[PDB]
Amino acid sequence: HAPGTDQMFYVGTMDGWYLDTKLNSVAIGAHWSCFIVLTITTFYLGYESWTSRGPSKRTSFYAGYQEEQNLALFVNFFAMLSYFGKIVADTLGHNFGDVGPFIIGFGNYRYADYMLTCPMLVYDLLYQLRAPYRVSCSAIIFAILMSGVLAEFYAEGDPRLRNGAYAWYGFGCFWFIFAYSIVMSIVAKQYSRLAQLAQDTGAEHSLHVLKFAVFTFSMLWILFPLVWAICPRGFGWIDDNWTEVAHCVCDIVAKSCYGFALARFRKTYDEELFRLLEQLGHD
Amino acid sequence: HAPGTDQMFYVGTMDGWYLDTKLNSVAIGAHWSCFIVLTITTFYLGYESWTSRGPSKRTSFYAGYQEEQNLALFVNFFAMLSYFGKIVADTLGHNFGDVGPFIIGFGNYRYADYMLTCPMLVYDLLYQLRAPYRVSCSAIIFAILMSGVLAEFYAEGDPRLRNGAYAWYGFGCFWFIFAYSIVMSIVAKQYSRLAQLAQDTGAEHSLHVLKFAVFTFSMLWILFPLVWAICPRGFGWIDDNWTEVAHCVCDIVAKSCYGFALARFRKTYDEELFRLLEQLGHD
Amino acid sequence: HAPGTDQMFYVGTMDGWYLDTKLNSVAIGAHWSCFIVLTITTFYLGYESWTSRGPSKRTSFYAGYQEEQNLALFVNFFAMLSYFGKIVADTLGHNFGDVGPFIIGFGNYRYADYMLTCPMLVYDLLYQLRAPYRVSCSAIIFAILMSGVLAEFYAEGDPRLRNGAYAWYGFGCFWFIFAYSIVMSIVAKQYSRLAQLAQDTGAEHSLHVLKFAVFTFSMLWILFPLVWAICPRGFGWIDDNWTEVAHCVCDIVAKSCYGFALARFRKTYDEELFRLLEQLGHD
């Protein structure tokens, strides 16, 4: 297994797959609650998607053609799946943390669940303001998430290779800072152009609601490096058992609040601001 | 390997990769026949694709721009690859069932071969009638297939974890029933609108051929849960050796018959029904 | 591990992951140089992409909407990542050749790094001439690369299964010959139509530069089967230590020269040839 040491590493193997769970009761309860709320948000958003009329309220299957409107749905849907298998683990009492086979887009690994969620989510949110460079942000966050997965892989491995985890941490943090700066800049410029093009709208309160939602949604990603630093992978100011509840509340804020905000926006928007958004998505 | 038991599980490991095959002569012959017919259907469909003129029969490389017309080709092509490696296993006499490394889109695992085939196939068939919600059905079937792969992973594992296989079976069956119901509903509504918009067509017999093909193609997926139930993973009314021939005949019906039906449709369709399909794909 | 033999195979396992490196100083230096030049080319191309004006030189974020112009960027970007982890291995002195977990699009395996690079690269280059059958070439090269990965998997395995490596070699070479022939034919026909439609251009020297670039770029892929034949996987006229430098120079020619050629083309093209390319992309 390892040279010079009789200890063996169970990460990425079926041997660690059959090990008993290292979680406690509160982690299982948090997983259950997160799965329940993800499922009910997915059901509610799908119910709204089935009864989703167009802006003119006469087009029947508007979501059937403008399928990107349902895009967040899929992400939220996958989030439910991203936890459902863990619930199965919570049923069986066996180890599930970074063990077993590696499959893209599943919650069997800590950061690999975000492969199909995070780039689509950021693409959808910047598409809602018709911001340019749609593919670029998704590619950047995909690369950062892959770096995070590989850093977590080095974290559990041989302690002689512990130094690479900090290097990949620095890599991911540098690209995340760059991505956050560029997305904040483009969002600020785009919404400034929208505001200077927002004359005689009649939805100023709705405009305030949407600007508050998008600014909070842009600034929410400050959780990831703080959470990584406070867990034992970084400075270790918290223990492992309280990391799972943190990840649950963070990705609930990321997904369910996003779905609720989009649902509340779609029941209050009007058509002239819509056509001004299409006008904005030109230059 | 496993606590309390000296037995070891060879699934997902190189140890089970080097094991001798568990198949018999008839399974090898069925694999050979299925690979041969898949290869000849792929060759025939590619030959038709090279000599594929437009509806006006003057556009030379119509398939070169409307590349989605070749889409089924790719699926059928991958199906050939999906069996070709198994033929190599049939050459070497070593174990190939759910062993070795896991790679997306290959036939080394029982259900993982359908990753690149089934969503593209369903998208192509519902696109042929210009049905809405194109991405949604593909995402649903992708999630169901991933659930099936993971259920098959639990099936071979530790018998103390056998209960999760039935839970994932219920999950996959519930979402498959939902998908089948919604796709049947949308197909029925879409073709009802086509029929009430099909006046003075001149291709009523061709219309009967295409409706028979699409209805049979919509109802063919009843094979999957019945096949899973009759094999030892479910009720076990059949043995393992006769499961491979069942999967061969089922995916041949799924792919080669689809290609033959599309080829026969493209040599008999006319242009006014074509433009009425574009008219249908509006509301 | 293996029946009848006490030897064990370290491929695809964490046991071979923790093994010491089999590389020497020159391989590490070549990896460092290749990573450095890939990083600087990515930085330069990103700097050009940020300051990328439209053909009329008044559209500010032309790349923000015509995002496919940045497509090669992403490939080159991934190439940097495709080597960066190897640099980490070169830091740690542990084995990295075809060991550890298998992840799509990474350089941990010899041919798996090209999953996200080669089809996008060929799609971008044939899109630059507006050639038809865009998806088909990408699918063909994806299948060939997957076959190469699996052949390399058989190469390291049990010597009783060495015969399958030659079969997959023949498969990959046959499909590569077919792909090369068809891409050469379509490129020749397309550029012949461009030349017979190139009247009063004013950029004949620029036309010569671009034709030389595209012909060299079309003929560069002759490196892959020659490199595979000369390494010990084939005829073995060279040793393992000199294969890494060959792969470095080959993929540098594939990626950095492509980026430099595209950058030099974008600083010299004019608008009438541009609109003639859009006219060409019709029939």
Author numbering:
A (entry chain C), B (entry chain A), C (entry chain B): 3 to 285
Quote the study's own text.
To date, there are no channelrhodopsin structures without bound retinal and the structural consequences of retinal binding, which could have implications for the design of functional variants, are unknown. We purified apo-ChRmine from cells grown without addition of all-trans retinal, reconstituted it into lipid nanodiscs, and determined its structure to 4.1 Å resolution. The lower resolution of the apo structure is due in part to fewer particles and anisotropy of the reconstruction due to preferred particle orientation and potentially an increase in overall ChRmine flexibility. The apo-ChRmine structure (consisting of residues 3–285) was modeled by combining portions de novo built (into well-defined regions) with docked portions of the ATR-bound structure (into less well-defined regions) prior to structure refinement. The structures are similar overall (r.m.s.d. = 0.8 Å); no major rearrangements in the overall fold are observed. However, subtle conformational changes are focused to the intracellular halves of TM1, TM5, TM6, and TM7, which bow out toward the membrane ~0.5 Å, 1 Å, 2 Å, and 1 Å, respectively. The overall effect is to expand the retinal binding pocket and loosen packing between TM6 and its neighboring helices TM5 and TM7 on the membrane facing sides. These changes may facilitate loading apo-ChRmine with retinal.
